[PDB]
């Protein structure tokens, strides 16, 4: 069958991937006792947009549920799936013949049918007539709450939909649950996004020089990903934090736009991940700007390496994700004490939630078509109201097919350190004579993407991770070199 | 005073640029007989957005009118200007101290006052209180129709605005008219965007190899512009059309995403322009993929080079832009006749609008903070309902300080050719046996950015243009042009 492909060394993605997703969704809905015979799933794709009131077009990137089901790259479409038969119909815009003046060949409906390997293609303005003739019982539309943004998913609507019975509650938890569990075909794409983003991270580590602006490395990363990987988009805005900016967790946005000059002795924390055909990657590499870890940098870095590897070694089906977050906290506290930054009982430190001073964010999150992927908090799974844990994007138990980031870090964040020093319950654990040395250190984060297997994990990411590996990479060693 | 800068070799842009724009706006409003004493201009900045229902952030780019007036890069702001005094107040979000963890330093109001060189800074949650204390007659807000998109400008709103008298008709035509005329400080930025984008086009011409994907050159272009120019955004989505795609005017978008392999013998038409601090550039270069023009390619290319230069040379204050569009049409028809694609009287061809078969788009447009900049069709300036001319984005007469693209092209577009061949009034001019050779040729566009001066134009773009320059550039020969 047909494949999406951007040529050269880029990945061929079979359109069968999306057919399988549609099949799996139907299979799930068929098992759902509340789904009526003759129901049809109705999804509305994204539409073209412009900047504010201008005619400056914004590059169109498909809505994630619609992409998951159909893989369609064009704006202005709808898509329906008959639950009982699995039959798929794509609705595409009707462009007047005169648009050929501007657009070139206007593609036929047969073109799209062949391209996307759907059962039928119709024009969008005919959706009411086509659905009327199929005599559906119920239209199942998409409405629900994203638990990371708090936004409500956009439910499909078309002129005449009021003539139909519409249910907008059943679909969302079901299609979310399908997205949580990745197919073999989806895993091939996520291996690829990790391959290209890993290569790009290595190129960035090889190219970094003291004196460069952070954004020069953002640019280089995105150029590698697009020119060598066919990744027109990033999965999220690149975070290129140097020096103290490596302690700024959302760094790189318009208000702090990767515009610092990298200095000798800085740590760099670069969190970047290309997107291929709407599939994410999310990788963070931490390393010394000048290519040589100081003793203090080695100690902080290796503490995060220890927690990274301990969590990866413990992950398997049945593990409760919050227990992994707490494992990373404990290890960080142990290692910060072995460094002289902290003193006292680590058991007592954990009871005081001291780990959250150094890692205020969650250990990791589902990843898929969105970088913060759907389904972390389905009904009945509760957020934990404790420092650090409250920032976790899922409190689920791990199961085969889930894809997660594993991203412990340690940061030296003044207002959190100062709060701790002001708090009699935490202040005694902090040794200021050593801690003072780490004010302005920034932070270290080591972020891997992994798949939960039947018995453990598969690591998707492939970047240098030991101090020796990183120093070798920055010294321009071939990848096929083993410190 | 302070300046915007991304370090290295990037341009320092004085915040005084925006202060001058505010002054100029007030001066126009003060002359407007409908403007009441004690009016306050109220603009609302852009807000942070995410992809659909996700928490995936979209990189924030400021709304163009707000940028023009204030130069502010942060989301969630408002800005007001007292018309009678010119006093400026920026309203910034009040962030809880707890935010220092994620988005970085919680800058004070004083930090922003110094950064933007405004007269006062307040928090957004205080805007109604602050404006109430100023006892305005009326709030002047932004509402109007963009004549390229057809969209209505988003008028400012805030909690409590209903307690004020608001006028949403006066401002838009006045701030649009200010934007049409670029200040010397604005021109320095547009010289820079054209410098960097010109350099990036040159690197692309040096790098193109048969067998590459179109998007490889888009990537290189944007990488040059960001890493060397500090241009995080492009002014519009890059058009990297090769072969028959160079005849596709709307190419490079999501539905046709620069995904063709460049083949030996193809023409390339690359329309790309970096954006710096929300100021545009818009440049198109056309050239053979393999670095050597064939005779047919040379003939089509030099025809557009001739119209490009004829239009630039004729532009001066008082020239009617539609006349420049028809000048290019006439030159194209002359050259296509010399080539043998056409036969007969060029006067009769013009009368039959045959030029629009080969150039269906407008000759060029205003450029500024938006690539298709505002103010092409103010009240009293009408669109001309003829082929080609109806696509013009302005029918104004030129005046010093206007910035325009000059972008004639010749394309071989099957829909338009077939229509012409069915029409006895146009078919007689077309030599089918010669035209057949050019089916699938693609197209050529040469796009320069220029400023109207007191006596002529200033050319901002600096890329290789003659056949000799282009071939030398692509062969990897040393030096400029
Ligand atoms: Mn990340
Ligand atoms: Mn992450
Ligand atoms: Mn252009
Ligand atoms: Mn243009
Ligand atoms: O992350
Ligand atoms: O253009």
UniProtKB/Swiss-Prot annotation, chain A:
GO terms for biological process: amino acid metabolic process; collagen catabolic process; negative regulation of programmed cell death; proteolysis. InterPro entries: Aminopep_P_N, Creatin/AminoP/Spt16_N, Creatinase/aminopeptidase-like, Pept_M24, Peptidase_M24B_aminopep-P_CS, X-Pro_dipept-like. Mn(2+) 2 binds at residues 282, 365, 407, 447. GO terms for molecular function: manganese ion binding; metalloaminopeptidase activity; metallocarboxypeptidase activity; peptidase activity; proline dipeptidase activity. It is an enzyme of class 3 (hydrolase). A dipeptide binds at residues 250, 282, 372, 393. Its EC number is 3.4.13.9. It comes from the Eukaryota. Keywords: Acetylation, Collagen degradation, Dipeptidase, Disease variant, Hydrolase, Manganese, Metal-binding, Metalloprotease, Phosphoprotein, Protease. Its cofactor is Mn(2+). Binds 2 manganese ions per subunit. It catalyses: Xaa-L-Pro dipeptide + H2O = an L-alpha-amino acid + L-proline. The keyword Repeat does not apply. GO terms for cellular component: extracellular exosome. PROSITE patterns: PROLINE_PEPTIDASE (PS00491). The modification Phosphoserine is found at residue 162. Dipeptidase that catalyzes the hydrolysis of dipeptides with a prolyl (Xaa-Pro) or hydroxyprolyl residue in the C-terminal position. The preferred dipeptide substrate is Gly-Pro, but other Xaa-Pro dipeptides, such as Ala-Pro, Met-Pro, Phe-Pro, Val-Pro and Leu-Pro, can be cleaved. Plays an important role in collagen metabolism because the high level of iminoacids in collagen. It is linked to Prolidase deficiency: A multisystem disorder associated with massive iminodipeptiduria and lack of or reduced prolidase activity in erythrocytes, leukocytes, or cultured fibroblasts. Clinical features include skin ulcers, developmental delay, recurrent infections, and a characteristic facies. PANTHER family: PEPTIDASE D (PTHR48480:SF2), PTHR48480. Belongs to the peptidase M24B family. Eukaryotic-type prolidase subfamily. This is Xaa-Pro dipeptidase. It comes from Homo sapiens. The lineage of its organism: Eukaryota, Metazoa, Chordata, Craniata, Vertebrata.
